[PDB]
Amino acid sequence: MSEESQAFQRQLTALIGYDVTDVSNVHDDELEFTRRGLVTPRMAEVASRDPKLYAMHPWVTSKPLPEYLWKKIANNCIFIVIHRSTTSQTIKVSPDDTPGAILQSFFTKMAEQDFVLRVCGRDEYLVGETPIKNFQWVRHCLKNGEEIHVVLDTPPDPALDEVRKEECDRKFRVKIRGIDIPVLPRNTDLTVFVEANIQHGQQVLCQRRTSPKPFTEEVLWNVWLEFSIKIKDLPKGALLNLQIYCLLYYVNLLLIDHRFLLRRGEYVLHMWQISGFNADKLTSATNPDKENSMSISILLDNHPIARAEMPNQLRKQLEAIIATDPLNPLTAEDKELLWHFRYESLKHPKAYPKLFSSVKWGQQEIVAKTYQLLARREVWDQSALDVGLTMQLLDCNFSDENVRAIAVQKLESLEDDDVLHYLLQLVQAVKFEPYHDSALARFLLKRGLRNKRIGHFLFWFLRSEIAQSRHYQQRFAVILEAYLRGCGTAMLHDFTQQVQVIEMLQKVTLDIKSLSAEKYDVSSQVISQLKQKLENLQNSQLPESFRVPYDPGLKAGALAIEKCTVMASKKKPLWLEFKCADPTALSNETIGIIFKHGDDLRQDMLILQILRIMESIWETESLDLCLLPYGCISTGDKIGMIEIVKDATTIAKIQQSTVGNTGAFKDEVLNHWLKEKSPTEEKFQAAVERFVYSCAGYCVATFVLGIGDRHNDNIMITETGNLFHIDFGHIERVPFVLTPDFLFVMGTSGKKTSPHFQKFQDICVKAYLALRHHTNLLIILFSMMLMTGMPQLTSKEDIEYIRDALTVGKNEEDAKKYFLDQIEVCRDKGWTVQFNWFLHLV
Numbered sequence: 001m002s003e004e005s006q007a008f009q010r011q012l013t014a015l016i017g018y019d020v021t022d023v024s025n026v027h028d029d030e031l032e033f034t035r036r037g038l039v040t041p042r043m044a045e046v047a048s049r050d051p052k053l054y055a056m057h058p059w060v061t062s063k064p065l066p067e068y069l070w071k072k073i074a075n076n077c078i079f080i081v082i083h084r085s086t087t088s089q090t091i092k093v094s095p096d097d098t099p100g101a102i103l104q105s106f107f108t109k110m111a112e113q114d115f116v117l118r119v120c121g122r123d124e125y126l127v128g129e130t131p132i133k134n135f136q137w138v139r140h141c142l143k144n145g146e147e148i149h150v151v152l153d154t155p156p157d158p159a160l161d162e163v164r165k166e167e168c169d170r171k172f173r174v175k176i177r178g179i180d181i182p183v184l185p186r187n188t189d190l191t192v193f194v195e196a197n198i199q200h201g202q203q204v205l206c207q208r209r210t211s212p213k214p215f216t217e218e219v220l221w222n223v224w225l226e227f228s229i230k231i232k233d234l235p236k237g238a239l240l241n242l243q244i245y246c247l248l249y250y251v252n253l254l255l256i257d258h259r260f261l262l263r264r265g266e267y268v269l270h271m272w273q274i275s276g277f278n279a280d281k282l283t284s285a286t287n288p289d290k291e292n293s294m295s296i297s298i299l300l301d302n303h304p305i306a307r308a309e310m311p312n313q314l315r316k317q318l319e320a321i322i323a324t325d326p327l328n329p330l331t332a333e334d335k336e337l338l339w340h341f342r343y344e345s346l347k348h349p350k351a352y353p354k355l356f357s358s359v360k361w362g363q364q365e366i367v368a369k370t371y372q373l374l375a376r377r378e379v380w381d382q383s384a385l386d387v388g389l390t391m392q393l394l395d396c397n398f399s400d401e402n403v404r405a406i407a408v409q410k411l412e413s414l415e416d417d418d419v420l421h422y423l424l425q426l427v428q429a430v431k432f433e434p435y436h437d438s439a440l441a442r443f444l445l446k447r448g449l450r451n452k453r454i455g456h457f458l459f460w461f462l463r464s465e466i467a468q469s470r471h472y473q474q475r476f477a478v479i480l481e482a483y484l485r486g487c488g489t490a491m492l493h494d495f496t497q498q499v500q501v502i503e504m505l506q507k508v509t510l511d512i513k514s515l516s517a518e519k520y521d522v523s524s525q526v527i528s529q530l531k532q533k534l535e536n537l538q539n540s541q542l543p544e545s546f547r548v549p550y551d552p553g554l555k556a557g558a559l560a561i562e563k564c565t566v567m568a569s570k571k572k573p574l575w576l577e578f579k580c581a582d583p584t585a586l587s588n589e590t591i592g593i594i595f596k597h598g599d600d601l602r603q604d605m606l607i608l609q610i611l612r613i614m615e616s617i618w619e620t621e622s623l624d625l626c627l628l629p630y631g632c633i634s635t636g637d638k639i640g641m642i643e644i645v646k647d648a649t650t651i652a653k654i655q656q657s658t659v660g661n662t663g664a665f666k667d668e669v670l671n672h673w674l675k676e677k678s679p680t681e682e683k684f685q686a687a688v689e690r691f692v693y694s695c696a697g698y699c700v701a702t703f704v705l706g707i708g709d710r711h712n713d714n715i716m717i718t719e720t721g722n723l724f725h726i727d728f729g730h731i732e733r734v735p736f737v738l739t740p741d742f743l744f745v746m747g748t749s750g751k752k753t754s755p756h757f758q759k760f761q762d763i764c765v766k767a768y769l770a771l772r773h774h775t776n777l778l779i780i781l782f783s784m785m786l787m788t789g790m791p792q793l794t795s796k797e798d799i800e801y802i803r804d805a806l807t808v809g810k811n812e813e814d815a816k817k818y819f820l821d822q823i824e825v826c827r828d829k830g831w832t833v834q835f836n837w838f839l840h841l842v
């Protein structure tokens with residue numbers, strides 16, 4: 001390539017956090033052929049997008065305005081303020097009006113048509129043929145009782161988005177030669193054997209074993225392991241999972257390559273070790289640690305793919321199977337029904353994952369029948385998109401490329417609004433794809449190229465994985481590189497400014513944590529050399545400003561060094577404040593960010609995403625539970641940034657403020673705090689109403705996810721009454737925190753039913769039922785969260801909680817009770833669970 005084409009790739013590598021052009025950790029050319037493979041879908045999408053709409057990235061929606069927002073417009077008129085520096089005029093607008101209509105009306109109501117309505121303070125433009133009700137920033141102000149401040153400026157130059165130019169009937173067998181490890185020390189002498197499995201989607205097709213020998217650094221066999229499954233019967237996506245028990249080590253090898261050719265030849269595969277099932281266990285990647293890892297030597301030498309109506313009772317049986325939740329196992333009898341009646345099953349889109357779980361993937365004849373069955377997709381295509389359903393077909397239980405492609409097919413109809421909701425979860429599912437190039441990877445690749453907000457989050461999501469996943473970093477980096485070669489030069493510049501800032505902060509953050517000790521503590525010296533380092537950074541060359549990674553409409557400017565400190569936690573996070581880099585911002589207020597090391601913010605990212613999903617469900621049913629899923633982005637390896645919620649305090653501090661003696665908790669204290677932080681009596685009532693809704697929402701959401709038993713410490717509250725949970729980094733009993741300080745705000749001092757307390761029970765039930773109409777979605781979002789989020793879990797046991805919690809297979813009146821009962825446990829326990837929480841530690 002060109003010299004400047006090489007300067008460009010090293011730019012990409014720094015942005016990616018991994019060198020894709022590197023070839024040290026490969027035993028074929030899947031990754032290279034995938035970089036090549038993704039050139040086309042990147043270029044099709046870059047060619048097709050409107051430059052103007054892409055430059056301005058209008059954030060918008062087709063969902064109807066929820067009821068609670070229609071009661072806020074009882075005049076059928078919405079007010080907009082249009083600013084210019086020396087002046088600004090308010091305009092009454094119809095909810096159906098297009099931004100152009102109001103621009104055209106702003107020239108008339110005065111007493112050259114090349115300007116745009118941008119939001120004051122944010123990189124957010126109101127443009128294109130959509131009614132202003134449909135703009136998400138309009139609905140944001142209508143919900144939180146704010147004004148719609150806008151400024152008439154110049155449309156941004158699409159020139160800045162420039163994309164730089166482009167240039168057998170035999171049975172299967174494997175020969176195990178041996179395993180070698182440099183240093184083996186663990187425990188007194190044990191035995192060691194290899195287990196070879198033919199896998200397709202978490203089903204083992206066939207399994208063989210070696211004879212066990214004593215565990216020492218070299219151990220040979222030279223055995224030919226003869227499987228009963230034939231070569232022709234082998235399906236695309238099939239793995240050869242090789243395992244060492246004494247389970248210590250594992251490695252995998254695809255048996256059909258990306259060119260549909262059977263795998264042949266010699267391979268020495270470096271293997272991953274187990275921590276003293278999960279998505280990592282499926283990876284075609286080999287351990288990059290060639291010096292200290294265990295390896296396996298193997299040999300292949302063996303292309304492929306070259307009327308009647310159902311009776312009444314059996315239909316009842318079938319339909320019953322289809323009705324069961326995703327976590328319900330299928331009997332051999334169950335699977336046989338589903339397959340035999342496959343044409344009737346096909347008529348029910350909710351049967352698809354069960355149906356596709358009844359397929360003998362290890363019989364060519366049956367997979368062909370399955371492909372034939374899939375060609376008459378009339379029912380599936382016409383079905384209304386069910387994100388839950390679609391997700392199930394993307395998990396670890398489906399390796400088939402065509403079964404997964406129908407899933408991605410349905411996704412194509414998601415609007416940007418919705419893709420943003422499931423982006424992270426979708427990114428995590430790439431991990432279940434047998435091959436690097438996949439329908440789904442192309443989908444994320446093209447949806448992000450199409451819209452800058454999806455592109456921005458796509459960037460950070462893929463970049464969190466690359467940084468802390470040797471198992472999938474190579475796959476994910478090939479994809480990030482594909483995206484970055486299409487996003488345009490503004491964004492590359494924008495990402496650079498962002499990466500530079502987090503790298504620069506990463507170094508400060510780590511030295512302070514290390515100079516820092518735990519309990520003690522802080523420590524003036526530490527907080528003084530924090531301000532020293534930061535003043536060193538500003539000049540120079542920390543970026544003049546950068547887009548805020550968890551909120552890319554926001555430009556953070558230079559730091560307010562005096563407002564920056566080191567937090568009072570044993571893990572030493574940096575409380576940073578930045579000046580807003582938009583001078584046309586209507587508020588002087590600073591951008592506050594907590595930069596943390598070395599927790600892993602992936603779990604929080606995930607949880608926060610589910611929470612935003614729950615809010616979106618409630619929005620349909622016209623409910624607003626006042627959740628605060630603040631910004632949280634994993635930026636690198638154990639390094640990430642967190643949005644600071646303005647005027648928020650910890651529930652524990654509000655209790656400690658009264659003399660702070662460990663565990664002595666007083667009921668009246670929270671209501672005392674709120675009333676004190678209230679500018680009027682009016683604002684106090686609003687805070688109580690804000691608390692009743694928020695507390696209600698966190699109660700429901702936190703219970704379903706089984707993260708309800710929390711310390712007072714990780715529950716926070718804004719001075720405006722907004723309660724919100726924090727810190728899922730870590731992950732007697734209580735279902736959720738509903739303590740007597742909370743019940744006193746609502747006006748209850750132990751078994752007394754007040755009007756606010758009645759409200760809480762009401763909203764809870766409404767909120768809990770609304771969630772249950774999405775049981776299948778939640779279950780699947782949660783099953784996936786565990787497999788791609790946590791190091792080792794039970795694919796059986798660990799998930800069930802949510803089945804119980806969601807009250808699967810129970811009528812709405814049993815569910816009303818079931819939750820109202822959980823409320824009574826909270827009131828029964830009182831302060832007891834909170835008391836033990838702080839007690840056991842010292």
Ligand SMILES: CC(C)(O)C1CCN(Cc2ccc3nc(-c4cccc5n[nH]cc45)nc(N4CCOCC4)c3n2)CC1
Pocket residue numbers: 565566567568575594604630642643644645646648649650726727728729
């Ligand atoms: C005075 C002093 C010592 O500087 C502080 C005292 C405490 N106070 C409130 C406080 C205390 C601890 C906090 N931990 C977190 C946090 C820590 C670890 C993992 C987390 N995942 N998600 C949030 C996490 N997040 C906070 N949020 C975020 C929301 O917006 C307000 C600050 C936060 N906030 C700030 C000033």
